Amino acid sequence: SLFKDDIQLNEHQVAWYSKDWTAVQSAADSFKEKAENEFFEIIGAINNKTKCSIAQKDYSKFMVENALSQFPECMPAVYAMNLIGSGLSDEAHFNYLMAAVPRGKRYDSTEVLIIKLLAKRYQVNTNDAINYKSILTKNGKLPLVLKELKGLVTDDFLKEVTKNVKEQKQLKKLALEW
Protein backbone atom coordinates (compact mmCIF):
# COMPACT_ATOMS: atom_id res chain seq x y z
CA SER A 1 0.00 0.00 0.00
CA LEU A 2 2.32 2.54 -1.50
CA PHE A 3 3.33 -0.38 -3.61
CA LYS A 4 0.54 -0.79 -6.11
CA ASP A 5 -0.02 -4.24 -7.57
CA ASP A 6 1.29 -5.78 -4.34
CA ILE A 7 0.27 -9.39 -3.94
CA GLN A 8 -2.32 -10.24 -1.27
CA LEU A 9 -0.83 -10.82 2.18
CA ASN A 10 -3.51 -11.70 4.72
CA GLU A 11 -3.65 -10.32 8.24
CA HIS A 12 -1.51 -13.23 9.39
CA GLN A 13 1.24 -12.99 6.81
CA VAL A 14 1.83 -9.29 7.55
CA ALA A 15 2.10 -10.07 11.23
CA TRP A 16 4.38 -13.04 11.18
CA TYR A 17 6.55 -11.69 8.35
CA SER A 18 7.18 -8.28 9.85
CA LYS A 19 7.58 -9.69 13.34
CA ASP A 20 5.52 -7.34 15.41
CA TRP A 21 4.23 -9.91 17.90
CA THR A 22 1.31 -7.83 19.13
CA ALA A 23 -0.39 -8.46 15.74
CA VAL A 24 0.67 -12.06 15.75
CA GLN A 25 -0.52 -12.22 19.31
CA SER A 26 -3.72 -10.53 18.39
CA ALA A 27 -3.83 -12.72 15.31
CA ALA A 28 -3.92 -15.77 17.56
CA ASP A 29 -6.46 -14.15 19.88
CA SER A 30 -9.05 -13.36 17.18
CA PHE A 31 -9.45 -17.05 16.25
CA LYS A 32 -10.56 -18.22 19.71
CA GLU A 33 -14.27 -18.70 20.50
CA LYS A 34 -16.13 -15.91 22.30
CA ALA A 35 -16.45 -16.38 26.06
CA GLU A 36 -20.22 -15.86 26.00
CA ASN A 37 -20.64 -18.44 23.25
CA GLU A 38 -18.75 -21.01 25.34
CA PHE A 39 -20.84 -20.38 28.45
CA PHE A 40 -23.91 -20.98 26.27
CA GLU A 41 -22.31 -23.97 24.57
CA ILE A 42 -21.90 -25.72 27.96
CA ILE A 43 -25.20 -25.07 29.74
CA GLY A 44 -27.05 -26.70 26.87
CA ALA A 45 -25.12 -29.94 27.05
CA ILE A 46 -26.05 -30.75 30.64
CA ASN A 47 -29.63 -29.85 29.71
CA ASN A 48 -30.24 -31.34 26.28
CA LYS A 49 -27.72 -34.01 27.25
CA THR A 50 -25.33 -33.58 24.29
CA LYS A 51 -21.58 -33.92 23.81
CA CYS A 52 -18.86 -31.60 24.77
CA SER A 53 -15.73 -31.31 26.88
CA ILE A 54 -14.27 -28.47 28.84
CA ALA A 55 -10.64 -27.56 29.55
CA GLN A 56 -10.73 -26.38 25.98
CA LYS A 57 -13.13 -23.91 27.66
CA ASP A 58 -13.42 -21.11 30.25
CA TYR A 59 -15.46 -22.41 33.21
CA SER A 60 -17.26 -20.58 36.02
CA LYS A 61 -18.61 -22.88 38.69
CA PHE A 62 -20.89 -19.91 39.47
CA MET A 63 -22.39 -19.44 35.98
CA VAL A 64 -23.48 -23.00 35.30
CA GLU A 65 -24.70 -23.11 38.88
CA ASN A 66 -26.68 -19.90 38.64
CA ALA A 67 -27.92 -20.27 35.05
CA LEU A 68 -29.04 -23.81 35.95
CA SER A 69 -30.86 -22.81 39.16
CA GLN A 70 -33.41 -21.25 36.83
CA PHE A 71 -35.53 -24.39 36.51
CA PRO A 72 -36.88 -26.01 39.75
CA GLU A 73 -36.25 -29.40 38.09
CA CYS A 74 -32.48 -28.60 38.14
CA MET A 75 -32.45 -27.23 41.74
CA PRO A 76 -31.70 -30.52 43.59
CA ALA A 77 -28.41 -31.02 41.76
CA VAL A 78 -27.48 -27.35 41.87
CA TYR A 79 -27.76 -27.64 45.63
CA ALA A 80 -25.49 -30.67 46.05
CA MET A 81 -22.91 -28.99 43.82
CA ASN A 82 -23.49 -26.00 46.06
CA LEU A 83 -22.78 -27.43 49.48
CA ILE A 84 -20.27 -29.91 48.13
CA GLY A 85 -19.06 -28.11 44.96
CA SER A 86 -15.96 -26.52 46.45
CA GLY A 87 -12.77 -28.38 45.55
CA LEU A 88 -14.44 -30.53 42.94
CA SER A 89 -12.60 -30.36 39.62
CA ASP A 90 -14.16 -27.78 37.28
CA GLU A 91 -14.30 -30.88 35.15
CA ALA A 92 -16.08 -32.95 37.78
CA HIS A 93 -18.60 -30.30 38.73
CA PHE A 94 -19.26 -30.49 35.02
CA ASN A 95 -19.92 -34.22 34.97
CA TYR A 96 -22.05 -34.19 38.06
CA LEU A 97 -24.55 -31.83 36.45
CA MET A 98 -24.32 -33.84 33.19
CA ALA A 99 -25.56 -37.18 34.51
CA ALA A 100 -27.55 -35.34 37.21
CA VAL A 101 -30.20 -32.91 35.81
CA PRO A 102 -32.24 -35.25 33.55
CA ARG A 103 -34.44 -33.35 31.13
CA GLY A 104 -33.86 -30.27 29.13
CA LYS A 105 -34.70 -26.84 27.82
CA ARG A 106 -33.40 -23.40 28.74
CA TYR A 107 -34.57 -19.83 28.45
CA ASP A 108 -21.30 -5.33 37.43
CA SER A 109 -18.50 -3.04 36.18
CA THR A 110 -19.74 0.54 35.96
CA GLU A 111 -21.54 0.21 39.31
CA VAL A 112 -18.35 -1.23 40.84
CA LEU A 113 -16.57 1.95 39.77
CA ILE A 114 -19.17 4.12 41.47
CA ILE A 115 -19.12 1.91 44.57
CA LYS A 116 -15.40 1.35 45.22
CA LEU A 117 -15.21 5.03 44.44
CA LEU A 118 -17.67 5.97 47.17
CA ALA A 119 -16.09 3.75 49.84
CA LYS A 120 -12.65 5.18 49.21
CA ARG A 121 -13.82 8.81 49.54
CA TYR A 122 -15.80 8.49 52.77
CA GLN A 123 -13.72 5.71 54.32
CA VAL A 124 -16.46 3.14 54.78
CA ASN A 125 -17.13 -0.49 53.79
CA THR A 126 -18.48 -1.79 50.47
CA ASN A 127 -21.76 -2.33 52.34
CA ASP A 128 -22.71 1.24 53.19
CA ALA A 129 -21.15 2.14 49.87
CA ILE A 130 -24.06 0.35 48.24
CA ASN A 131 -26.51 2.17 50.49
CA TYR A 132 -24.67 5.38 49.61
CA LYS A 133 -25.20 4.93 45.86
CA SER A 134 -28.86 4.25 46.71
CA ILE A 135 -29.35 7.30 48.98
CA LEU A 136 -27.94 9.49 46.24
CA THR A 137 -29.14 8.21 42.83
CA LYS A 138 -32.66 8.55 44.17
CA ASN A 139 -31.96 11.72 46.13
CA GLY A 140 -29.55 14.40 45.01
CA LYS A 141 -29.23 12.32 41.81
CA LEU A 142 -25.44 12.22 42.51
CA PRO A 143 -23.91 13.42 39.31
CA LEU A 144 -22.98 16.17 41.75
CA VAL A 145 -20.84 13.86 43.91
CA LEU A 146 -19.73 12.10 40.72
CA LYS A 147 -18.45 15.65 39.99
CA GLU A 148 -16.29 16.12 43.10
CA LEU A 149 -15.10 12.52 42.98
CA LYS A 150 -14.31 12.41 39.30
CA GLY A 151 -11.20 13.94 40.84
CA LEU A 152 -9.78 10.67 42.01
CA VAL A 153 -9.77 8.29 39.01
CA THR A 154 -6.02 7.59 39.03
CA ASP A 155 -4.69 5.19 36.37
CA ASP A 156 -3.39 2.84 39.11
CA PHE A 157 -6.92 2.83 40.59
CA LEU A 158 -8.36 1.52 37.34
CA LYS A 159 -6.29 -1.68 37.56
CA GLU A 160 -8.14 -2.74 40.78
CA VAL A 161 -11.44 -2.27 38.96
CA THR A 162 -10.81 -4.45 35.85
CA LYS A 163 -7.88 -5.92 33.83
CA ASN A 164 -8.33 -4.51 30.29
CA VAL A 165 -9.11 -1.77 27.74
CA LYS A 166 -12.53 -1.99 29.37
CA GLU A 167 -10.92 0.20 32.07
CA GLN A 168 -9.78 3.19 29.98
CA LYS A 169 -13.21 3.30 28.39
CA GLN A 170 -14.46 3.91 31.94
CA LEU A 171 -11.74 6.51 32.55
CA LYS A 172 -13.59 8.77 30.13
CA LYS A 173 -17.17 7.72 30.71
CA LEU A 174 -16.94 9.35 34.12
CA ALA A 175 -15.04 12.31 32.73
CA LEU A 176 -18.17 12.75 30.61
CA GLU A 177 -21.91 12.91 31.41
CA TRP A 178 -22.05 14.38 34.96
Binding site: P72, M81, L83, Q123, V124, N131, I135
Partner: protein, 294 residues
Protein backbone atom coordinates in the same frame (compact mmCIF):
# COMPACT_ATOMS: atom_id res chain seq x y z
CA UNK B 1 -20.16 18.83 65.24
CA UNK B 2 -20.60 18.96 61.47
CA UNK B 3 -18.25 18.40 58.60
CA UNK B 4 -19.92 21.21 56.66
CA UNK B 5 -18.70 20.18 53.16
CA UNK B 6 -19.54 16.42 53.03
CA UNK B 7 -22.36 14.93 50.99
CA UNK B 8 -24.07 12.45 53.32
CA UNK B 9 -25.89 13.04 56.56
CA UNK B 10 -24.48 10.03 58.46
CA UNK B 11 -21.11 11.26 57.23
CA UNK B 12 -21.67 14.97 57.78
CA UNK B 13 -23.08 14.51 61.32
CA UNK B 14 -20.94 11.51 62.44
CA UNK B 15 -20.33 11.97 66.16
CA UNK B 16 -16.78 13.22 66.47
CA UNK B 17 -16.24 12.20 70.03
CA UNK B 18 -17.27 9.35 72.28
CA UNK B 19 -19.94 11.25 74.21
CA UNK B 20 -21.64 12.52 71.06
CA UNK B 21 -22.45 8.91 70.06
CA UNK B 22 -25.85 7.56 71.07
CA UNK B 23 -25.15 4.55 73.25
CA UNK B 24 -25.97 2.18 76.12
CA UNK B 25 -25.06 3.11 79.72
CA UNK B 26 -22.51 0.33 80.39
CA UNK B 27 -21.16 0.84 76.88
CA UNK B 28 -20.36 4.61 76.93
CA UNK B 29 -18.63 4.24 80.32
CA UNK B 30 -16.54 1.33 79.07
CA UNK B 31 -15.43 3.45 76.14
CA UNK B 32 -14.81 6.51 78.27
CA UNK B 33 -12.82 4.10 80.41
CA UNK B 34 -10.54 3.24 77.50
CA UNK B 35 -9.80 6.68 76.08
CA UNK B 36 -9.16 7.76 79.68
CA UNK B 37 -5.84 5.90 79.53
CA UNK B 38 -5.05 7.88 76.36
CA UNK B 39 -3.68 4.79 74.57
CA UNK B 40 -5.73 2.16 72.76
CA UNK B 41 -5.07 -1.59 73.01
CA UNK B 42 -6.05 -4.03 70.26
CA UNK B 43 -9.84 -4.02 70.03
CA UNK B 44 -12.60 -6.06 68.44
CA UNK B 45 -15.83 -4.13 68.29
CA UNK B 46 -18.62 -6.55 67.53
CA UNK B 47 -22.34 -5.83 66.81
CA UNK B 48 -24.09 -8.19 65.51
CA UNK B 49 -27.24 -6.04 64.98
CA UNK B 50 -26.30 -3.74 62.07
CA UNK B 51 -26.42 0.04 61.84
CA UNK B 52 -25.33 0.32 65.47
CA UNK B 53 -22.39 1.92 63.69
CA UNK B 54 -19.31 -0.03 64.72
CA UNK B 55 -17.07 1.92 62.45
CA UNK B 56 -18.41 5.15 64.02
CA UNK B 57 -17.48 4.16 67.57
CA UNK B 58 -14.08 3.15 66.19
CA UNK B 59 -13.44 6.24 64.13
CA UNK B 60 -14.30 7.89 67.46
CA UNK B 61 -12.02 6.07 69.89
CA UNK B 62 -9.23 7.06 67.61
CA UNK B 63 -10.24 10.70 67.81
CA UNK B 64 -10.42 10.76 71.63
CA UNK B 65 -6.96 9.30 71.84
CA UNK B 66 -5.73 11.78 69.23
CA UNK B 67 -4.29 8.90 67.24
CA UNK B 68 -3.08 8.96 63.66
CA UNK B 69 -5.48 6.50 62.15
CA UNK B 70 -5.38 4.37 59.08
CA UNK B 71 -8.70 3.15 57.77
CA UNK B 72 -9.28 -0.01 55.80
CA UNK B 73 -12.45 -1.54 54.43
CA UNK B 74 -12.18 -5.11 55.71
CA UNK B 75 -13.05 -6.38 52.24
CA UNK B 76 -9.92 -4.60 50.99
CA UNK B 77 -7.38 -5.80 53.52
CA UNK B 78 -5.59 -8.36 51.46
CA UNK B 79 -2.38 -10.20 52.15
CA UNK B 80 -0.09 -7.89 50.27
CA UNK B 81 -1.97 -4.79 51.23
CA UNK B 82 -1.14 -5.75 54.85
CA UNK B 83 2.49 -6.43 53.83
CA UNK B 84 3.15 -2.91 52.47
CA UNK B 85 0.66 -0.16 53.37
CA UNK B 86 -0.10 -1.35 56.87
CA UNK B 87 3.44 -2.37 57.60
CA UNK B 88 4.49 0.97 56.00
CA UNK B 89 2.08 2.66 58.40
CA UNK B 90 2.59 0.38 61.41
CA UNK B 91 6.37 0.73 61.27
CA UNK B 92 7.13 4.44 61.16
CA UNK B 93 7.18 6.55 64.34
CA UNK B 94 5.01 9.57 63.84
CA UNK B 95 6.59 13.03 63.92
CA UNK B 96 3.81 14.13 66.25
CA UNK B 97 3.93 11.01 68.32
CA UNK B 98 0.38 10.02 68.44
CA UNK B 99 -0.52 6.39 68.39
CA UNK B 100 -0.99 4.84 64.99
CA UNK B 101 -4.25 2.83 65.08
CA UNK B 102 -5.31 0.61 62.19
CA UNK B 103 -9.10 0.36 61.98
CA UNK B 104 -10.15 -2.63 59.93
CA UNK B 105 -13.88 -2.44 59.28
CA UNK B 106 -15.97 -5.60 58.81
CA UNK B 107 -13.11 -8.11 59.00
CA UNK B 108 -15.69 -10.86 58.81
CA UNK B 109 -15.51 -10.79 55.04
CA UNK B 110 -14.44 -14.20 53.60
CA UNK B 111 -11.13 -15.19 52.00
CA UNK B 112 -9.53 -12.61 54.23
CA UNK B 113 -8.93 -15.60 56.50
CA UNK B 114 -5.34 -15.64 55.41
CA UNK B 115 -4.65 -11.99 56.04
CA UNK B 116 -5.99 -12.68 59.46
CA UNK B 117 -3.22 -15.21 60.20
CA UNK B 118 -0.52 -13.02 58.71
CA UNK B 119 -1.58 -10.53 61.37
CA UNK B 120 -0.85 -12.66 64.39
CA UNK B 121 2.88 -12.04 64.34
CA UNK B 122 2.36 -8.46 63.18
CA UNK B 123 0.29 -7.24 66.11
CA UNK B 124 3.03 -8.35 68.53
CA UNK B 125 5.52 -6.83 66.09
CA UNK B 126 4.54 -3.22 66.48
CA UNK B 127 2.99 -2.77 69.91
CA UNK B 128 4.39 0.54 70.95
CA UNK B 129 3.63 2.56 67.83
CA UNK B 130 0.46 0.71 66.93
CA UNK B 131 -2.85 -1.02 67.80
CA UNK B 132 -5.56 -2.56 65.64
CA UNK B 133 -9.32 -2.17 66.00
CA UNK B 134 -11.31 -4.90 64.28
CA UNK B 135 -14.96 -4.42 63.40
CA UNK B 136 -17.07 -7.58 63.16
CA UNK B 137 -20.76 -8.55 62.75
CA UNK B 138 -20.00 -12.09 63.75
CA UNK B 139 -16.99 -12.82 65.99
CA UNK B 140 -16.66 -16.35 64.74
CA UNK B 141 -15.28 -14.68 61.59
CA UNK B 142 -12.33 -13.33 63.55
CA UNK B 143 -9.81 -16.18 64.07
CA UNK B 144 -9.20 -17.17 67.70
CA UNK B 145 -5.57 -16.09 67.98
CA UNK B 146 -6.67 -12.71 66.79
CA UNK B 147 -9.50 -12.74 69.33
CA UNK B 148 -6.75 -13.40 71.86
CA UNK B 149 -4.54 -10.43 71.19
CA UNK B 150 -7.62 -8.24 71.21
CA UNK B 151 -10.06 -6.85 73.72
CA UNK B 152 -13.36 -8.28 72.60
CA UNK B 153 -16.04 -5.59 73.29
CA UNK B 154 -19.53 -6.63 72.60
CA UNK B 155 -22.30 -4.18 71.80
CA UNK B 156 -25.32 -3.07 73.56
CA UNK B 157 -28.57 -4.35 74.92
CA UNK B 158 -30.11 -1.05 75.74
CA UNK B 159 -31.54 -1.17 79.28
CA UNK B 160 -35.09 0.10 79.49
CA UNK B 161 -33.39 3.20 80.95
CA UNK B 162 -31.01 3.31 77.99
CA UNK B 163 -34.07 2.94 75.77
CA UNK B 164 -35.78 6.09 76.92
CA UNK B 165 -32.68 8.24 77.42
CA UNK B 166 -31.14 7.15 74.07
CA UNK B 167 -34.58 7.97 72.57
CA UNK B 168 -34.54 11.53 73.80
CA UNK B 169 -30.97 11.86 72.58
CA UNK B 170 -32.04 10.65 69.13
CA UNK B 171 -34.88 13.16 68.97
CA UNK B 172 -32.87 16.21 70.13
CA UNK B 173 -30.07 15.26 67.72
CA UNK B 174 -32.30 14.56 64.75
CA UNK B 175 -34.11 17.78 65.65
CA UNK B 176 -30.82 19.63 65.55
CA UNK B 177 -29.82 18.49 62.06
CA UNK B 178 -33.17 19.14 60.39
CA UNK B 179 -32.33 22.59 61.83
CA UNK B 180 -28.96 22.96 60.18
CA UNK B 181 -30.21 21.34 56.94
CA UNK B 182 -33.08 23.80 56.88
CA UNK B 183 -35.66 20.97 56.68
CA UNK B 184 -39.15 21.66 57.99
CA UNK B 185 -40.65 20.06 61.09
CA UNK B 186 -44.38 19.81 60.35
CA UNK B 187 -45.15 17.62 63.35
CA UNK B 188 -43.10 16.65 66.41
CA UNK B 189 -44.66 13.15 66.59
CA UNK B 190 -43.24 12.53 63.08
CA UNK B 191 -39.72 13.09 64.45
CA UNK B 192 -40.21 10.70 67.36
CA UNK B 193 -42.10 8.24 65.19
CA UNK B 194 -38.81 7.90 63.31
CA UNK B 195 -36.71 7.53 66.49
CA UNK B 196 -39.11 4.67 67.35
CA UNK B 197 -39.65 3.02 63.90
CA UNK B 198 -36.10 1.71 63.64
CA UNK B 199 -34.66 2.16 67.13
CA UNK B 200 -31.36 0.57 67.72
CA UNK B 201 -30.30 1.50 64.18
CA UNK B 202 -29.98 5.28 64.02
CA UNK B 203 -27.53 5.24 61.16
CA UNK B 204 -30.56 3.74 59.42
CA UNK B 205 -33.12 6.32 60.55
CA UNK B 206 -30.92 9.20 59.29
CA UNK B 207 -30.62 7.40 55.97
CA UNK B 208 -34.41 7.41 55.70
CA UNK B 209 -34.43 11.23 56.09
CA UNK B 210 -31.75 11.49 53.41
CA UNK B 211 -34.47 10.27 51.08
CA UNK B 212 -37.11 -4.85 57.25
CA UNK B 213 -40.54 -6.47 56.97
CA UNK B 214 -40.36 -10.10 55.79
CA UNK B 215 -43.75 -9.55 54.16
CA UNK B 216 -42.52 -9.71 50.53
CA UNK B 217 -41.18 -13.26 51.02
CA UNK B 218 -43.98 -14.46 53.34
CA UNK B 219 -46.40 -13.38 50.62
CA UNK B 220 -44.46 -15.11 47.83
CA UNK B 221 -44.37 -18.41 49.75
CA UNK B 222 -48.15 -18.40 50.15
CA UNK B 223 -48.47 -17.64 46.40
CA UNK B 224 -46.07 -20.56 45.90
CA UNK B 225 -44.45 -18.83 42.90
CA UNK B 226 -40.80 -19.06 41.89
CA UNK B 227 -40.05 -15.90 39.90
CA UNK B 228 -40.68 -13.82 43.04
CA UNK B 229 -38.85 -16.15 45.42
CA UNK B 230 -35.90 -16.64 43.07
CA UNK B 231 -35.56 -12.84 43.02
CA UNK B 232 -36.05 -12.32 46.76
CA UNK B 233 -33.27 -14.72 47.71
CA UNK B 234 -30.29 -12.58 46.72
CA UNK B 235 -31.87 -9.72 48.70
CA UNK B 236 -31.34 -11.49 52.00
CA UNK B 237 -28.07 -13.27 51.16
CA UNK B 238 -26.33 -10.52 53.16
CA UNK B 239 -27.44 -11.54 56.65
CA UNK B 240 -28.75 -15.07 56.46
CA UNK B 241 -28.28 -15.70 60.17
CA UNK B 242 -30.63 -12.82 60.96
CA UNK B 243 -33.14 -13.48 58.19
CA UNK B 244 -33.55 -17.19 58.81
CA UNK B 245 -34.38 -16.33 62.42
CA UNK B 246 -37.05 -13.81 61.41
CA UNK B 247 -38.48 -16.29 58.94
CA UNK B 248 -39.01 -19.22 61.30
CA UNK B 249 -40.49 -16.68 63.70
CA UNK B 250 -43.32 -15.40 61.47
CA UNK B 251 -43.98 -18.62 59.51
CA UNK B 252 -44.60 -20.41 62.84
CA UNK B 253 -47.78 -18.42 63.56
CA UNK B 254 -49.05 -18.15 59.99
CA UNK B 255 -48.94 -21.87 59.16
CA UNK B 256 -50.58 -25.15 60.20
CA UNK B 257 -49.44 -27.11 63.33
CA UNK B 258 -48.29 -30.05 61.20
CA UNK B 259 -46.31 -27.63 59.02
CA UNK B 260 -44.57 -26.27 62.12
CA UNK B 261 -42.82 -29.58 62.73
CA UNK B 262 -41.77 -29.49 59.05
CA UNK B 263 -40.81 -25.82 58.80
CA UNK B 264 -38.27 -26.56 61.54
CA UNK B 265 -36.75 -29.58 59.85
CA UNK B 266 -36.44 -27.59 56.60
CA UNK B 267 -35.07 -24.38 58.07
CA UNK B 268 -33.00 -26.17 60.68
CA UNK B 269 -31.35 -28.30 58.03
CA UNK B 270 -30.75 -25.28 55.81
CA UNK B 271 -29.35 -23.08 58.62
CA UNK B 272 -27.23 -26.00 59.69
CA UNK B 273 -25.50 -26.27 56.31
CA UNK B 274 -24.97 -22.56 55.61
CA UNK B 275 -21.24 -21.93 55.68
CA UNK B 276 -20.66 -25.21 53.96
CA UNK B 277 -22.72 -23.96 51.01
CA UNK B 278 -20.72 -22.39 48.21
CA UNK B 279 -23.32 -19.97 46.88
CA UNK B 280 -25.31 -18.54 49.76
CA UNK B 281 -27.76 -16.79 47.48
CA UNK B 282 -28.68 -20.09 45.82
CA UNK B 283 -28.69 -22.00 49.10
CA UNK B 284 -31.34 -19.51 50.19
CA UNK B 285 -33.28 -20.12 46.99
CA UNK B 286 -33.16 -23.83 47.78
CA UNK B 287 -34.83 -23.08 51.13
CA UNK B 288 -37.68 -21.02 49.61
CA UNK B 289 -38.82 -23.67 47.13
CA UNK B 290 -38.53 -26.38 49.78
CA UNK B 291 -40.81 -24.28 52.01
CA UNK B 292 -43.43 -23.31 49.41
CA UNK B 293 -43.76 -27.04 48.59
CA UNK B 294 -44.25 -28.41 52.12
Amino acid sequence: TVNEKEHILEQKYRPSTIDECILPAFDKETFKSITSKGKIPHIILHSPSPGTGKTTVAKALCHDVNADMMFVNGSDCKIDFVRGPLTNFASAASFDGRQKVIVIDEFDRSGLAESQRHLRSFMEAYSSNCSIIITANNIDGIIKPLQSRCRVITFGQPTDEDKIEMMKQMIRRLTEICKHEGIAIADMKVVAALVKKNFPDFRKTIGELDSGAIDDVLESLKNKDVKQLRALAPKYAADYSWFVGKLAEEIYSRVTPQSIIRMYEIVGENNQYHGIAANTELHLAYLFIQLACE
